[PDB]
Write a protein that binds this ligand. Sequence first.
Ligand SMILES: *CC(=O)N1CC2(C1)CN(S(=O)(=O)c1ccc(I)cc1)CCO2
Ligand SMILES: *CC(=O)N1CC2(C1)CN(S(=O)(=O)c1ccc(I)cc1)CCO2
Ligand SMILES: [Cl-]
Ligand SMILES: [Cl-]
Ligand SMILES: [Mg+2]
Ligand SMILES: [Mg+2]
Ligand SMILES: [Mg+2]
Ligand SMILES: [Mg+2]
Ligand SMILES: [Mg+2]
Ligand SMILES: [Mg+2]
Lengths: 9, 9, 235, 235
Amino acid sequence: QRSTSTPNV
Amino acid sequence: QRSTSTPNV
Amino acid sequence: GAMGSMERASLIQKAKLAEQAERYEDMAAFMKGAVEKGEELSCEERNLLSVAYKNVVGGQRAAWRVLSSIEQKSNEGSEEKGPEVREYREKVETELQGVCDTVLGLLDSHLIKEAGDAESRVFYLKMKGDYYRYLAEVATGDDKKRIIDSARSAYQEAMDISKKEMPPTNPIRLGLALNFSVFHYEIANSPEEAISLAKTTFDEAMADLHTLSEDSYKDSTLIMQLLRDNLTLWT
Amino acid sequence: GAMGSMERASLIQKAKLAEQAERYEDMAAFMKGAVEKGEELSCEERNLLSVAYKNVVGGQRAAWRVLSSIEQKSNEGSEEKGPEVREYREKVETELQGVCDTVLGLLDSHLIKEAGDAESRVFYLKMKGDYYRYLAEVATGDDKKRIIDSARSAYQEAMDISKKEMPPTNPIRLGLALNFSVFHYEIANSPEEAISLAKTTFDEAMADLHTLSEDSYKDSTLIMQLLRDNLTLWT
Ligand SMILES: *CC(=O)N1CC2(C1)CN(S(=O)(=O)c1ccc(I)cc1)CCO2
Ligand SMILES: *CC(=O)N1CC2(C1)CN(S(=O)(=O)c1ccc(I)cc1)CCO2
Ligand SMILES: [Cl-]
Ligand SMILES: [Cl-]
Ligand SMILES: [Mg+2]
Ligand SMILES: [Mg+2]
Ligand SMILES: [Mg+2]
Ligand SMILES: [Mg+2]
Ligand SMILES: [Mg+2]
Ligand SMILES: [Mg+2]
């Protein structure tokens, strides 16, 4: 599973 | 609410 | 056009890849290229064409509805915000119309005229009805009535063939009837016609389910549920 | 370019409309036009720029991953299917690279050089790191090492400023640290560096939460949870 980067907000 | 038309399959 | 140099089979292969990648604009371009090779399309290839353009126009229709709603609200106590909402709604609308015109163009040059089997001819005429219906959704001018009539005429021709040539459970026949019922309800201001068509279609399909294999039964009942969903919404 | 004739404020207004309509390619084009007016961007306008391009490149990255996986499988007992998978992966890759180059171009001409406040400068340097990282995801050639180093250098400059100029709970500082940790883990083959950065970032933010209003607390803790999610994944 891929690491999470900063999402849109 | 909108009527449902044929979906993709 | 731009796909002129690519093999038909490669266009079909790439359409399938684009579908997997959820790249529907690419998928549509590949399938337009395939149609423009001039050969008739198989059932699977018609499905690829359908999926690609439905997804493209579907996104445009959703965007158009968002923008139209904002525009309507602007025209109620509303503060003046200038021409931008209208301009941008118009931009999206023009693009949507362009996609519809592209599909109608493929149908007219020359998919429909070469389609002689019931499955192909009904499918293409349904598609013609659908894309005129999408044009009708955004029409307001001198031409809205003619667009509506064009949709009606395509659906009616498809209906006439489907009733003569296909069993009542045939998925193309069912999907056509579903969409023509939506036309009646949403476009033609004919809710009673819509309800009648959906009811009759459902009932005649129900009576023919016994003739079907397990797999065909699954296909037919899915669309029948959509008829039922609309009947519930409409009554 | 094509947005040269539109007012800055109209481009911003239309970017917001495009966001509402989930029209992210349009949103990106409007915000590119706004940047090219030559004025600095506010925090809200930087957010619009960010959202637009993140959504565009995000779809490209997802598509690229699908196609790369199909391509890898083709190269295992696999039957030869010709050049189409590679060609189409290359097409998507080229488009992705183009978007990255466009963003990096805006940053270089002239967003970064005019950014003197910590929030703006850190944000833009983070963005530079991110888009080099996306280039690195698809790089295989003579240049992969240099692309990685370019990402690293941008993130490091951003990190240095953020540590000096922003509290440990600042969302831009936190998001930068999150993304630089992902760089370390996913790109630079440095999982220990990734874990260390995520841990230290989380812990220093935790210790500063007491200084925050309810609303700022919400913002900081959201990103902290993402650090924690990655730490859980990575350990
Ligand atoms: C075999 C053939 O020509 N096909 C075209 C189709 C398969 C069916 N169409 S459709 O719009 O008629 C349709 C029927 C049932 C369902 I559930 C969805 C759509 C779509 C493309 O593939
Ligand atoms: C105020 C300012 O310059 N902003 C840019 C931002 C608000 C924040 N970035 S971000 O990538 O730094 C980010 C931080 C926290 C979260 I949750 C997501 C993203 C995104 C654009 O808006
Ligand atoms: Cl516009
Ligand atoms: Cl290609
Ligand atoms: Mg040939
Ligand atoms: Mg007022
Ligand atoms: Mg118009
Ligand atoms: Mg001006
Ligand atoms: Mg074999
Ligand atoms: Mg390449």
